[PDB]
RNA sequence: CUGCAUGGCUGUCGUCAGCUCGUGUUGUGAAAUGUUGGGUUAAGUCCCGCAACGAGCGCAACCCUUAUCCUUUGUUGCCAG
């Protein structure tokens, strides 16, 4: 039950020379559904091809997480080009919730029980890389305690 | 090894600060490497090369410098290595995600030349298209069965194979080099004493290192 | 615009002609009306035959028919003598002895008349139109070609409106006069729409 | 009456030189790099060198034709031997 998820679509229109041209960009995620996350950028002259390039990069990208029991133990921040994504462990209700570009990212990591906001740039290609910087930043307790001698 | 005590090569007063610990003195007025340490320095790196080959790491030999421009396959035909002898440029290894199209194009010939469909005319394929395959075997045949990027790189001279060192240091590939009297280990991760301009010597030296890559089939 | 009539004005360019006939100009309209009549009774004994096109030549005191088929067995029938029915349906209309030639189609999944049939018979079975359209192109472009375009119209994928969507691979020179384009329009004619497909195939100039 | 409902028919920059597919490398990215530099051309044209390569399209080539021999014709045309 591995699932390949889309975050956002963008269209960039440029006057040439005489007349105009336009291309589309997509941002997708695949990961592993538990403890591993991965994302891809894709750009083409049509939406289905931009998504197809993005999936072909997202299956060839990976990040390992310090994850246990599908959940967070501490608040964490991650930053990329003005996106300052801050994450809190969410309990006793709905698990998603959170910013519109984060909902698939948490679910392909297996951590879709988290309240997250962007606190800056809302641009999805900054937001995803600030959310993933937070999944890279988090650690186990376990390791934050195991830094002690013996 | 020195056997009858004979010593040859380049440089009779000059040597670089990075070679300072290898040279012991001079013989036949040429600077000589310490004969007590040559064999264990050579064996040290040759065992790591055998271990890379024993975990299915593929070994790429660069023979652009004249003393190996044929010997890299003519003195190594039963060693299970891959080879390059053409002049290097930017992208000469780092562009592999594109250059794989030429590998796909080579396999499309050697999957057709074996069939009787290729033989039924006098020259249209059985001469004109064998001349097309034998042309691409010359420039890419020495890497056609490798795939992706190398797991170790070997060079005859770090002064002349310097762009193969550059492209390997861009991909993260460990580099093995031969040294004698003037060498810079910047971008090189293993060094061994040997020959770089012999007429002679290099043919036997290539068999003394590359045969440990076919031991990786064990 | 700039779609033109490929089966009309473009069909006489870099291609062999499908009819050749002489008549007195005082009866030209009646001999043009019979050029259709000698097809009307014939394309009903080819109804299963996967024919890409037919050619009907009317020399003096003669009529000569060529059939370009993907299935040469189904036009010759039991013991291979049932091909004479293709003469007898036109000789009974023209009132002169008729000749028949059966010609083989090279790569029947690269011929525009037959590719549009192989898409229409999938749309009648309610398959996802993009799957049939993309498989028709990935098949044809691997059999040969320099480029191909497909355009599907009517009730696309379960849509509440008629619509039109297309897909193209390689080059399709529609504004070039010497391009030798192979074309067809087909229609499925259902209780719930007309459901149409149009295909343009390019394989080489002249 | 109206291209201010269309299709077809063509008109134009213009024989202008430039436009894409599979790709590499660089940047968060618009996009860049290459297609820049040295020589040159009818021309992103042909070369030299280089972080770029293959494959296509247009150009050129291809197709049409003219300036003059050779062989074939040989008349009620031509006429040298």
XYZ file of C-alpha atoms (C1' of nucleotides) in Angstrom:
655
model
C 0.000 0.000 0.000
C 2.754 2.478 -1.059
C 1.091 5.675 -2.444
C 2.454 8.337 -4.828
C 1.096 11.815 -3.828
C 0.974 15.286 -5.489
C 1.541 18.529 -3.460
C 1.032 21.426 -5.938
C 1.086 22.564 -9.614
C 2.512 25.864 -11.015
C 2.310 27.431 -14.553
C 5.064 29.831 -15.780
C 4.117 31.951 -18.848
C 6.791 33.893 -20.783
C 6.530 36.274 -23.768
C 9.297 35.382 -26.251
C 10.095 37.130 -29.022
C 6.608 37.519 -30.650
C 3.819 35.630 -28.832
C 4.131 33.467 -25.683
C 5.317 30.085 -24.305
C 4.383 28.334 -21.041
C 5.627 25.413 -18.902
C 4.268 23.602 -15.840
C 6.045 22.522 -12.631
C 4.889 19.785 -10.221
C 6.103 18.722 -6.748
C 5.414 15.057 -5.673
C 6.255 12.699 -2.761
C 6.540 8.850 -2.426
C 8.791 7.974 0.579
C 8.139 4.579 2.243
C 4.977 5.085 4.466
C 7.077 4.644 7.671
C 10.382 6.281 8.875
C 11.470 7.343 5.310
C 10.368 10.280 3.115
C 11.283 11.370 -0.442
C 10.261 14.173 -2.843
C 10.718 15.150 -6.521
C 10.629 18.281 -8.698
C 9.407 17.957 -12.333
C 9.054 20.594 -15.109
C 7.543 20.122 -18.617
C 5.385 21.839 -21.342
C 2.269 19.929 -20.026
C 0.926 19.028 -16.506
C 0.860 15.157 -16.852
C 4.544 15.243 -18.009
C 5.577 17.610 -15.164
C 3.956 15.171 -12.666
C 5.589 12.193 -14.508
C 9.114 13.819 -14.221
C 8.387 14.653 -10.567
C 7.411 11.000 -9.727
C 10.555 9.785 -11.588
C 12.653 12.023 -9.237
C 10.569 11.344 -6.082
C 11.154 7.519 -6.430
C 14.952 8.322 -6.751
C 15.138 10.563 -3.614
C 15.186 9.451 0.057
C 15.609 10.828 3.603
C 15.834 8.611 6.739
C 13.954 9.733 9.901
C 14.700 9.000 13.589
C 11.061 7.676 13.803
C 9.444 5.273 16.331
C 5.763 4.166 16.726
C 4.579 6.387 13.757
C 4.632 9.575 15.989
C 6.600 12.655 17.267
C 7.909 13.110 20.858
C 9.088 16.802 20.670
C 8.233 20.099 18.835
C 10.604 20.696 15.843
C 11.430 23.449 13.287
C 12.821 23.333 9.737
C 13.752 26.269 7.468
C 14.153 26.848 3.713
C 14.196 30.275 1.876
C 11.646 32.086 4.148
C 9.462 28.989 4.953
C 9.877 28.433 8.741
C 7.768 25.274 9.180
C 7.135 24.465 12.857
C 5.629 21.088 13.886
C 3.826 20.034 17.113
C 2.630 16.477 18.093
C -1.211 16.352 17.715
C -3.472 14.132 19.898
C -7.064 13.399 21.000
C -8.702 14.180 17.588
C -8.204 14.536 13.802
C -4.590 13.909 12.602
C -4.735 16.154 9.440
C -5.227 19.353 10.047
C -1.941 21.253 9.227
C -0.854 23.406 6.208
C -2.134 22.334 2.753
C 1.369 21.409 1.348
C 2.322 19.279 4.444
C -0.577 16.720 4.485
C 0.803 14.240 1.944
C 4.452 14.763 3.174
C 3.611 13.587 6.716
C 1.518 10.635 5.382
C 4.267 9.177 3.092
C 6.594 9.443 6.133
C 3.958 7.658 8.355
C 3.710 10.670 10.809
C 0.247 12.122 9.854
C -0.667 12.993 13.485
C 1.073 16.417 13.591
C -0.047 20.076 13.591
C 2.200 22.162 11.306
C 2.209 25.825 10.056
C 4.575 27.636 7.655
C 5.259 30.910 9.615
C 6.612 32.708 6.504
C 6.797 31.876 2.771
C 3.715 29.801 1.689
C 5.304 28.852 -1.676
C 4.941 24.981 -1.810
C 8.511 24.350 -3.205
C 9.936 26.183 -0.140
C 7.378 24.755 2.365
C 8.045 21.048 1.460
C 11.853 21.599 1.863
C 11.278 23.308 5.247
C 8.924 20.433 6.382
C 11.565 17.865 5.290
C 14.328 19.892 7.074
C 12.182 19.348 10.237
C 11.906 15.550 9.572
C 15.731 15.616 9.145
C 16.046 17.719 12.351
C 13.948 15.462 14.700
C 15.727 12.834 16.866
C 14.889 9.914 19.261
C 15.090 9.873 23.132
C 17.042 7.290 22.920
C 19.725 9.446 21.099
C 19.130 12.836 22.920
C 19.612 10.934 26.226
C 22.150 8.323 24.925
C 24.732 11.158 24.301
C 25.685 10.501 27.991
C 28.744 8.297 28.706
C 27.909 4.524 29.110
C 61.764 -5.675 -6.692
C 65.277 -4.864 -8.086
C 66.858 -8.393 -8.635
C 70.217 -7.721 -10.447
C 70.241 -4.113 -8.947
C 69.272 -2.265 -12.205
C 67.459 1.112 -11.950
C 66.142 3.544 -14.620
C 63.690 6.460 -15.156
C 63.186 10.246 -14.955
C 64.682 12.952 -12.623
C 68.357 13.109 -11.425
C 68.193 16.099 -8.970
C 64.522 17.346 -8.828
C 61.718 15.907 -6.627
C 58.543 17.422 -5.078
C 57.856 17.856 -1.280
C 54.905 15.321 -1.445
C 57.337 12.519 -2.595
C 59.892 13.332 0.209
C 59.146 10.204 2.411
C 59.173 7.648 -0.504
C 62.676 8.368 -1.925
C 65.670 6.900 -0.001
C 68.616 8.101 -2.167
C 69.786 7.618 -5.771
C 70.999 4.752 -8.045
C 72.304 5.165 -11.610
C 72.016 8.912 -10.547
C 68.124 8.616 -10.687
C 66.174 9.028 -7.396
C 65.113 5.617 -5.938
C 62.220 4.537 -3.635
C 63.090 2.547 -0.461
C 63.373 -1.137 -1.614
C 62.355 -2.424 1.875
C 58.946 -0.578 1.711
C 58.001 -0.929 -2.031
C 56.349 -4.411 -1.769
C 54.298 -3.732 1.440
C 53.157 -0.293 0.026
C 52.061 -2.098 -3.188
C 50.304 -5.013 -1.353
C 48.454 -2.609 1.053
C 46.364 -0.978 -1.718
C 46.143 -4.133 -3.915
C 44.262 -5.955 -1.107
C 41.637 -3.111 -0.888
C 41.282 -3.266 -4.692
C 40.691 -7.079 -4.401
C 38.099 -6.437 -1.617
C 36.185 -3.884 -3.781
C 36.192 -6.465 -6.634
C 35.083 -9.187 -4.097
C 31.897 -7.114 -3.328
C 31.093 -6.706 -7.077
C 32.718 -3.250 -7.326
C 33.649 -2.540 -10.980
C 37.200 -1.299 -11.665
C 37.958 1.334 -14.325
C 41.565 1.690 -15.634
C 42.653 4.910 -17.407
C 45.451 4.482 -19.978
C 45.664 7.826 -21.836
C 49.453 8.135 -21.214
C 51.482 6.368 -23.972
C 52.983 3.528 -21.838
C 49.433 2.006 -21.329
C 47.434 3.144 -24.483
C 47.279 -0.551 -25.665
C 48.553 -2.515 -22.619
C 45.355 -1.518 -20.647
C 43.617 -4.311 -22.714
C 46.567 -6.067 -24.515
C 48.326 -6.923 -21.198
C 44.924 -7.365 -19.400
C 42.493 -9.603 -21.435
C 41.630 -12.058 -18.582
C 41.438 -9.660 -15.576
C 37.663 -8.686 -15.647
C 38.435 -4.886 -15.692
C 37.007 -1.949 -17.713
C 39.207 0.544 -19.660
C 39.466 4.044 -21.226
C 42.374 5.254 -23.462
C 40.779 8.256 -25.323
C 41.481 11.981 -24.535
C 39.448 13.320 -21.580
C 37.131 16.389 -21.467
C 34.591 17.888 -19.039
C 31.717 15.340 -18.726
C 33.985 12.403 -19.900
C 32.663 10.419 -16.878
C 30.160 12.750 -15.027
C 27.667 12.712 -18.021
C 26.908 8.898 -17.600
C 23.090 9.514 -17.308
C 23.262 10.707 -20.961
C 26.174 8.560 -22.327
C 24.145 5.382 -21.410
C 22.263 6.084 -24.701
C 25.464 5.015 -26.582
C 25.600 1.787 -24.474
C 21.917 1.059 -25.408
C 22.895 1.756 -29.081
C 25.904 -0.688 -28.871
C 23.766 -3.511 -27.353
C 21.276 -2.984 -30.241
C 24.091 -4.165 -32.643
C 25.493 -7.211 -30.736
C 21.867 -8.480 -30.257
C 21.503 -8.447 -34.109
C 24.979 -9.537 -35.457
C 24.539 -13.027 -33.869
C 21.359 -13.780 -35.968
C 21.193 -15.386 -39.481
C 18.947 -12.371 -40.464
C 22.212 -10.318 -40.380
C 24.084 -12.844 -42.650
C 21.691 -13.270 -45.676
C 23.340 -10.499 -47.872
C 26.964 -10.156 -49.180
C 27.960 -6.830 -47.457
C 24.800 -4.739 -46.438
C 25.205 -5.866 -42.785
C 27.870 -8.670 -42.723
C 30.564 -6.069 -43.751
C 29.011 -2.526 -43.722
C 27.345 -3.025 -40.269
C 30.168 -5.170 -38.737
C 32.369 -2.115 -39.615
C 29.768 -0.080 -37.592
C 29.971 -2.374 -34.496
C 33.824 -2.724 -34.616
C 33.938 1.142 -34.682
C 31.851 1.578 -31.490
C 33.722 -1.287 -29.707
C 36.920 0.857 -30.136
C 35.528 3.980 -28.299
C 32.945 2.456 -25.866
C 33.400 -1.413 -25.920
C 35.834 -1.203 -22.922
C 32.895 0.082 -20.717
C 29.718 -1.423 -22.434
C 29.203 -4.209 -19.826
C 29.892 -1.984 -16.746
C 26.676 0.077 -16.168
C 26.354 3.296 -14.093
C 29.633 4.636 -12.588
C 32.886 2.863 -11.387
C 33.477 1.706 -7.779
C 37.268 2.378 -8.050
C 39.449 4.318 -10.565
C 43.084 3.429 -11.541
C 45.569 5.932 -13.160
C 49.136 5.592 -14.573
C 50.177 9.254 -13.857
C 48.398 11.872 -11.680
C 49.992 14.622 -13.878
C 48.496 13.298 -17.182
C 45.234 11.596 -15.989
C 44.390 14.755 -13.973
C 40.861 15.203 -15.516
C 40.024 11.544 -14.742
C 41.010 12.395 -11.127
C 38.843 15.612 -11.372
C 35.726 13.755 -12.704
C 36.207 10.923 -10.128
C 36.443 13.522 -7.284
C 33.131 14.998 -8.601
C 31.351 11.552 -8.360
C 33.053 10.474 -5.062
C 34.965 7.503 -6.640
C 38.181 6.347 -4.788
C 41.324 6.822 -6.976
C 44.427 4.559 -7.082
C 47.670 5.968 -8.663
C 51.255 4.899 -9.557
C 54.191 7.028 -8.144
C 57.957 7.220 -8.995
C 59.792 10.638 -8.530
C 57.226 13.547 -8.818
C 53.521 13.064 -7.873
C 50.725 15.066 -6.183
C 48.268 12.900 -4.082
C 45.646 15.768 -4.115
C 42.429 13.927 -5.231
C 44.151 10.443 -4.872
C 43.122 8.053 -2.041
C 45.615 5.146 -2.638
C 49.253 5.291 -3.943
C 51.672 2.525 -5.096
C 55.352 2.671 -6.328
C 55.944 1.661 -10.006
C 56.578 2.708 -13.631
C 54.888 5.480 -15.756
C 57.094 5.753 -18.920
C 58.667 2.295 -19.517
C 58.571 0.363 -22.853
C 58.819 -2.571 -21.012
C 57.795 -2.894 -17.293
C 54.164 -1.481 -17.476
C 52.820 -4.595 -19.329
C 53.941 -6.854 -16.425
C 52.875 -4.257 -13.794
C 49.261 -4.170 -15.142
C 49.051 -8.017 -14.832
C 50.516 -7.796 -11.291
C 47.530 -5.552 -10.203
C 44.539 -6.258 -12.519
C 44.497 -10.111 -12.137
C 43.157 -9.640 -8.548
C 39.869 -8.294 -10.085
C 39.087 -11.742 -11.666
C 39.643 -13.244 -8.168
C 36.435 -11.239 -7.355
C 34.536 -13.969 -9.354
C 35.457 -16.496 -6.586
C -9.473 26.488 -39.093
C -6.545 25.174 -41.181
C -7.799 21.545 -40.675
C -8.876 21.169 -44.349
C -10.384 18.008 -46.012
C -7.666 15.240 -46.073
C -10.059 12.763 -47.843
C -10.823 15.570 -50.397
C -8.291 18.079 -51.847
C -5.175 16.582 -50.063
C -5.842 12.994 -51.282
C -4.704 13.719 -54.896
C -1.204 14.880 -53.648
C 1.892 12.475 -53.587
C -0.640 9.535 -53.461
C -2.058 7.143 -56.099
C -5.670 8.026 -57.150
C -8.597 5.855 -55.910
C -10.600 6.356 -59.195
C -9.701 6.846 -62.885
C -12.477 7.132 -65.499
C -13.337 8.927 -68.757
C -16.811 10.006 -69.938
C -18.535 12.411 -72.331
C -18.894 15.738 -70.422
C -22.696 15.682 -71.259
C -23.001 12.596 -68.916
C -20.150 13.320 -66.412
C -22.600 13.692 -63.472
C -24.219 10.244 -64.181
C -20.787 8.508 -64.468
C -19.705 10.255 -61.198
C -22.990 8.996 -59.594
C -22.081 5.419 -60.716
C -18.496 5.844 -59.313
C -20.263 5.917 -55.914
C -22.819 3.192 -56.924
C -20.028 0.615 -57.740
C -18.760 1.180 -54.138
C -22.218 1.169 -52.433
C -22.936 -2.559 -53.260
C -19.254 -3.648 -52.753
C -18.342 -2.321 -49.231
C -21.113 -4.621 -47.813
C -19.198 -7.789 -48.958
C -16.087 -6.305 -47.226
C -17.946 -5.527 -43.946
C -15.573 -7.785 -41.809
C -12.509 -7.569 -44.099
C -10.310 -4.817 -42.377
C -9.829 -2.994 -45.730
C -7.738 0.237 -45.577
C -8.961 1.463 -49.009
C -10.417 0.307 -52.340
C -9.368 1.389 -55.863
C -11.784 1.259 -58.843
C -10.439 1.806 -62.361
C -12.897 2.031 -65.340
C -10.885 1.693 -68.627
C -12.827 1.435 -71.909
C -15.023 -1.774 -71.965
C -13.566 -2.835 -68.533
C -13.648 -2.336 -64.730
C -10.720 -3.325 -62.426
C -10.909 -3.385 -58.606
C -8.038 -3.563 -56.058
C -8.787 -4.263 -52.375
C -6.104 -3.396 -49.751
C -6.829 -5.848 -46.864
C -5.301 -6.712 -43.471
C -7.032 -10.193 -43.728
C -6.637 -11.787 -47.224
C -8.442 -15.080 -46.216
C -11.853 -13.503 -45.322
C -12.181 -11.936 -48.854
C -11.464 -15.223 -50.792
C -13.753 -17.551 -48.700
C -14.085 -21.388 -49.003
C -11.522 -22.931 -51.423
C -10.434 -19.337 -52.359
C -13.068 -18.998 -55.198
C -15.593 -16.790 -53.245
C -13.556 -13.693 -54.352
C -15.674 -13.774 -57.564
C -18.595 -12.332 -55.496
C -16.617 -9.015 -55.393
C -16.814 -9.022 -59.239
C -20.504 -10.110 -59.424
C -21.734 -7.264 -57.101
C -20.186 -4.568 -59.426
C -20.525 -6.301 -62.838
C -24.332 -6.480 -62.160
C -24.286 -2.608 -61.746
C -21.813 -1.614 -64.528
C -23.077 -4.204 -67.138
C -19.447 -5.124 -68.192
C -16.900 -7.833 -67.101
C -15.106 -6.946 -63.824
C -11.573 -7.874 -62.521
C -10.450 -8.385 -58.880
C -6.991 -8.027 -57.208
C -6.453 -8.612 -53.459
C -3.517 -6.581 -52.063
C -1.839 -7.059 -48.663
C -1.625 -4.147 -46.152
C 1.836 -3.666 -44.605
C 1.630 -3.088 -40.838
C -2.228 -3.007 -40.331
C -1.762 -1.320 -36.874
C -0.039 1.658 -38.619
C -2.874 2.273 -41.223
C -5.191 5.243 -40.349
C -8.527 3.538 -41.378
C -7.706 0.509 -39.164
C -6.130 2.355 -36.171
C -9.367 4.424 -35.877
C -11.385 1.118 -35.929
C -9.088 -0.371 -33.200
C -9.863 2.751 -31.054
C -13.659 2.896 -31.834
C -14.075 -0.822 -30.853
C -12.372 0.025 -27.500
C -14.578 3.127 -26.859
C -17.678 0.906 -27.563
C -16.353 -1.299 -24.659
C -16.138 1.809 -22.332
C -12.315 1.657 -21.781
C -10.478 4.781 -20.519
C -9.975 6.857 -23.725
C -6.345 7.923 -22.826
C -5.305 4.238 -22.418
C -6.629 3.272 -25.872
C -5.221 6.523 -27.404
C -1.715 6.172 -25.803
C -1.547 2.386 -26.640
C -2.455 3.119 -30.290
C 0.488 5.621 -30.511
C 3.030 3.483 -28.530
C 2.141 0.574 -30.904
C 2.309 2.568 -34.199
C 5.525 4.548 -33.311
C 7.259 1.148 -32.536
C 6.067 -0.338 -35.900
C 7.584 2.700 -37.711
C 6.441 6.324 -38.316
C 8.085 9.771 -37.827
C 5.049 10.979 -35.832
C 1.344 10.397 -35.087
C -1.621 12.361 -33.600
C -4.944 11.065 -32.199
C -7.994 13.191 -31.210
C -11.004 11.696 -29.312
C -14.445 13.386 -29.047
C -17.708 12.563 -27.178
C -18.371 11.527 -23.528
C -14.607 11.289 -22.640
C -14.074 8.901 -19.659
C -17.724 9.326 -18.357
C -17.942 13.165 -18.859
C -21.400 14.918 -18.745
C -20.528 16.952 -21.910
C -19.304 15.951 -25.420
C -15.657 17.363 -25.162
C -12.494 16.822 -27.270
C -8.932 15.772 -26.153
C -5.787 14.741 -28.133
C -2.308 13.154 -27.869
C 0.718 13.456 -30.249
C 4.215 11.879 -30.580
C 6.997 12.971 -33.015
C 6.328 15.248 -36.049
C 3.003 15.531 -37.950
C 3.454 17.944 -40.926
C -0.194 19.118 -41.507
C 0.790 22.431 -43.215
C 3.410 20.767 -45.543
C 2.003 19.861 -48.989
C 4.274 16.783 -49.795
C 3.920 15.025 -46.387
C 1.860 11.916 -47.532
C -0.318 12.024 -44.346
C -2.632 9.018 -43.758
C -6.013 10.043 -42.247
C -9.487 8.855 -41.120
C -12.549 10.083 -39.112
C -14.603 7.372 -37.268
C -17.861 7.437 -35.231
C -19.276 4.807 -32.748
C -22.994 5.967 -32.923
C -24.347 4.901 -29.479
C -27.562 5.564 -27.484
C -25.515 8.096 -25.382
C -23.400 9.983 -28.016
C -21.783 9.854 -31.476
C -18.315 9.187 -29.884
C -15.685 10.038 -32.508
C -11.967 9.507 -33.223
C -9.666 11.278 -35.720
C -6.087 10.082 -36.514
C -3.170 11.640 -38.491
C -0.098 9.456 -39.341
C 3.270 10.637 -40.810
C 5.922 8.116 -42.078
C 7.898 10.081 -44.723
C 7.673 12.819 -47.393
C 6.659 12.094 -51.055
C -25.992 43.410 -44.237
C -21.646 40.806 -41.649
C -14.967 37.697 -42.015
C -17.966 41.613 -35.651
C -20.859 33.547 -36.866
C -17.621 29.935 -39.789
C -14.972 26.304 -43.286
C -12.241 26.673 -47.598
C -9.157 29.910 -50.559
C -4.570 32.089 -49.098
C -1.802 36.642 -47.629
C 2.915 38.274 -44.315
C 7.965 38.574 -41.461
C 10.761 35.171 -45.580
C 14.891 31.678 -47.874
C 14.334 34.801 -42.429
C 17.569 31.314 -39.207
C 15.861 29.470 -36.121
C 12.409 25.608 -33.227
C 12.016 20.717 -30.461
C 12.433 15.276 -28.180
C 15.574 11.937 -24.751
C 19.213 13.849 -21.556
C 23.775 16.122 -18.347
C 25.659 20.037 -15.236
C 23.983 24.843 -11.973
C 20.413 27.716 -8.874
C 15.338 28.003 -3.643
C 13.594 29.491 -8.276
C 12.088 32.708 -12.954
C 15.574 30.330 -15.600
C 20.670 29.574 -16.873
C 24.679 26.532 -19.007
C 25.366 24.437 -23.779
C 23.711 27.903 -28.375
C 29.444 31.651 -24.380
C 34.997 32.134 -26.254
C 38.719 32.031 -31.068
C 38.208 32.070 -36.867
C 34.145 32.360 -40.602
C 29.571 32.335 -43.592
C 24.292 32.637 -47.687
C 23.168 30.704 -42.468
C 23.423 28.707 -34.866
C 26.835 28.107 -41.342
C 31.405 25.418 -41.328
C 35.545 24.749 -38.231
C 39.087 25.331 -33.598
C 38.878 24.711 -28.541
C 35.772 23.868 -24.312
C 30.920 20.732 -19.860
C 28.330 18.822 -22.875
C 25.908 14.626 -26.122
C 22.764 12.037 -29.233
C 18.303 12.602 -32.383
C 15.068 15.479 -35.398
C 13.074 19.788 -38.367
C 14.188 24.145 -41.402
C 19.001 25.801 -44.408
C 22.248 23.351 -47.914
C 21.525 18.802 -50.321
C 16.889 16.727 -52.795
C 13.499 18.099 -57.124
C 12.892 21.606 -61.867
C 15.953 24.162 -65.464
C 19.854 26.768 -68.637
C 25.321 27.841 -70.915
C 28.236 22.903 -74.389
C 30.002 17.962 -76.237
C 28.741 12.433 -77.135
C 25.276 8.655 -79.028
C 20.430 7.743 -81.118
C 16.586 10.343 -85.738
C 17.485 11.959 -91.134
C 11.893 13.770 -93.647
C 9.414 17.705 -98.445
C 14.595 20.317 -93.126
C 20.670 20.508 -93.771
C 24.563 19.593 -97.428
C 30.293 19.113 -95.567
C 32.423 14.267 -97.461
